[PDB]
């Protein structure tokens, strides 16, 4: 009776969409983390007197404890301060060094912090000391006005992975370029799955508008909706509503 199918439509819908918005919030609150601990860490690093970071000795002796505490606090991979002389203070995973073989003004997190006064997120990519995925917090750290350097913030992109892997629902998330990046099924993570049709019907219905879509010739419903530079989504079969 398309009464009763009406109230198993919306009930499902309410479910998918509400589990949606758990995922949604799991993106958020791991950036928001990142960003207030790298906000703190900036703050730390500006309250020292000039003294303090006027040569590259003082720099190594005064900051890099604050950098390998605060990586400790949050296990960081990297936490590192670079310098307009091409030098960084490097506090890896494994005494801070400050390191002039590491060509950081051709790096992204470099270049982009100083073109905002915001905290840049860079996407995931393979961090070059490490050797890991990792998504970078970067900021550009002033003093009075004065540029002291800027400050990178390294978190393994598994760390989100794992969070999105555990919420509930078969929800997951596309990067930037469409490609796959985490999921509750782990299966889905098979790079040669097409995600053409759930991404089709997105583009064709928006954020947060439930749809139904095919696949080998049985309906499903989904969800998706942007979530920073990410496109979270959600599907079930449509069993639910007609059997
Ligand atoms: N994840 C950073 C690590 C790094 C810091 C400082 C200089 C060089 C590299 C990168 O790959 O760019
Ligand atoms: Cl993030």
């Given at each position: 009776?398309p009464?009763?199918?009406?109230?198993?439509?919306?009930?499902?819908?309410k479910?998918?969409?509400?589990?949606?918005?758990?995922?949604?919030?799991?993106?958020?609150?791991?950036?928001?983390?990142?960003?207030?601990?790298?906000?703190?860490?900036?703050?730390?690093?500006?309250?020292?007197?000039?003294?303090?970071?006027?040569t590259?000795?003082?720099?190594?002796?005064?900051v890099?404890?604050?950098?390998?505490?605060?990586?400790?606090?949050?296990?960081?991979?990297?936490?590192?301060?670079?310098?307009?002389?091409?030098?960084?203070?490097?506090?890896?995973?494994?005494?801070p060094?400050?390191?002039?073989?590491?060509?950081?003004?051709?790096?992204?997190?470099?270049?982009?912090?100083?073109?905002?006064?915001?905290?840049?997120?860079?996407?995931?990519?393979?961090?070059?000391?490490?050797?890991?995925?990792?998504?970078?917090?970067?900021?550009?750290?002033?003093?009075?006005?004065?540029?002291?350097?800027?400050?990178?913030?390294?978190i393994?992109?598994?760390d989100?992975?794992?969070?999105?892997?555990?919420?509930?629902?078969?929800?997951?998330?596309?990067?930037?370029?469409?490609?796959?990046?985490?999921?509750?099924?782990?299966?889905?993570?098979?790079?040669?799955?097409?995600?053409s049709?759930?991404?089709?019907?997105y583009?064709?219905?928006?954020?947060?508008?439930?749809?139904?879509?095919?696949?080998?010739?049985?309906?499903?419903?989904?969800?998706?909706?942007?979530?920073?530079?990410?496109?979270?989504?959600?599907?079930?079969?449509?069993?639910?509503?007609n059997?």
């Amino acid at each position: 009776d398309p009464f009763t199918k009406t109230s198993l439509y919306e009930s499902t819908l309410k479910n998918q969409t509400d589990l949606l918005k758990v995922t949604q919030s799991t993106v958020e609150d791991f950036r928001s983390t990142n960003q207030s601990f790298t906000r703190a860490l900036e703050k730390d690093i500006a309250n020292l007197p000039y003294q303090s970071l006027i040569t590259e000795e003082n720099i190594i002796n005064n900051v890099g404890p604050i950098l390998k505490y605060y990586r400790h606090s949050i296990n960081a991979l990297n936490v590192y301060l670079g310098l307009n002389n091409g030098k960084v203070l490097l506090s890896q995973k494994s005494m801070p060094e400050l390191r002039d073989d590491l060509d950081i003004k051709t790096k992204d997190w470099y270049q982009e912090a100083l073109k905002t006064n915001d905290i840049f997120v860079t996407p995931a990519y393979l961090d070059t000391v490490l050797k890991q995925y990792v998504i970078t917090y970067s900021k550009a750290i002033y003093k009075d006005g004065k540029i002291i350097g800027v400050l990178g913030v390294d978190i393994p992109s598994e760390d989100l992975q794992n969070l999105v892997a555990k919420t509930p629902g078969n929800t997951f998330l596309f990067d930037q370029k469409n490609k796959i990046f985490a999921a509750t099924n782990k299966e889905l993570l098979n790079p040669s799955i097409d995600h053409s049709p759930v991404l089709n019907a997105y583009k064709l219905n928006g954020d947060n508008n439930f749809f139904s879509y095919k696949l080998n010739n049985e309906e499903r419903l989904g969800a998706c909706t942007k979530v920073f530079a990410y496109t979270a989504c959600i599907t079930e079969s449509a069993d639910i509503i007609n059997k």
